[PDB]
Structure 1
């Protein structure tokens, strides 16, 4: 196990994943997009955990956390919630950067509408060499983090 009795060390495993798959020739992503690349992998990890009740069958989807149907595991189910929330605390940092740097920070994902609003052409080319020059996240760098 790594530091403070968790087998992760989320800081170093991020910075090890960031250097090993670094490039500026690759494009980068938007703050809404990186959470769905995360939920693509650890999504199907959670539904394998079934959460049966005390008698064989399943339990109703209302009032799961009730301190009464805690089965043979809860910390492994709680492990994926902390791996999601670590990226969520970093998903906002790109959004709250690109908000105050002039662009619109779309943390929320767009619906069934004009797909690819793409604010590249709207704001001038100084902004695309502002946010992505400071820091940036490839789609490869989230495939290799988790």
Structure 2
């Protein structure tokens, strides 16, 4: 919902005003990136379809004949060609969204995790493999920063 700093609703003009940034913002960016990826796939299909002459339906149609399928005038040739190159079924989209949401949920840090200890070892274990003497590529002749 993105409540205000005092607990009120934002006015839809101050949604991204940067003083109302809170938690759930990472989740919102994840959802927006999912939508951007699906939009990229859909736009690729639309660009293919409009490169075949037929209508590239990136935006939903709105007219009196909106109910009819706009692929009828196509003589059954570039239709099967398009279905040969890109064919995105609804089951595929739902499965991708299911997998992505499941993975995002599973990626959350679990309560009780010894996250401090894990970070300490994750910063310290690579620290035992690097030399205390600074070893440089022979020929750089840059300043000797430790």
Q: What TM-score, normalized to structure 2?
A: 0.61
Bigger-Rg structure (1/2): 2
SS of the residue corresponding to residue 122 of structure 1 reads: coil
After superposing on structure 2, the runs of 4+ consecutive aligned residues of structure 1 that deviate more than 4 Å are none
5+ residue gaps, structure 2, are: 98-146
| Higher RCO (CA 8 Å, separation ≥ 6 residues) | 1
Tell me the CA shift for residue 73 of structure 1.
3.2
Is 1:144 equivalent to 2:107 in the alignment? no
- Superposition CA RMSD, Å: 1.4
Is 1:78 equivalent to 2:29 in the alignment? yes
The residue that corresponds to 1:131 in the other structure is 82
Tell me the CA shift for residue 112 of structure 1.
5.3
Tell me the CA shift for residue 117 of structure 1.
3.0
The residue that corresponds to 1:60 in the other structure is 11
Q: What TM-score, normalized to structure 1?
A: 0.61
Which digits, 9 at most, give the CA deviation of each residue in 1:75-117, with x for residues without a partner? 1111100000001111110000011112111211112532333
CA–CA distance in structure 2, aligned partners of residues 134 and 71 of structure 1? 43
Task: Provide closer, same or farther for how the CA distance between residues 119 and 112 of structure 1 changes in structure 2, counting only shifts above 3 A.
Answer: closer
Select the residue among 60, 70, 91 that pairs with 1:109. Answer: 60
CA–CA distance in structure 2, aligned partners of residues 104 and 66 of structure 1? 38
5+ residue gaps, structure 1, are: 1-49
SS of the residue corresponding to residue 37 of structure 2 reads: helix
SS of the residue corresponding to residue 117 of structure 1 reads: coil
Task: Provide closer, same or farther for how the CA distance between residues 61 and 132 of structure 1 changes in structure 2, counting only shifts above 3 A.
Answer: same
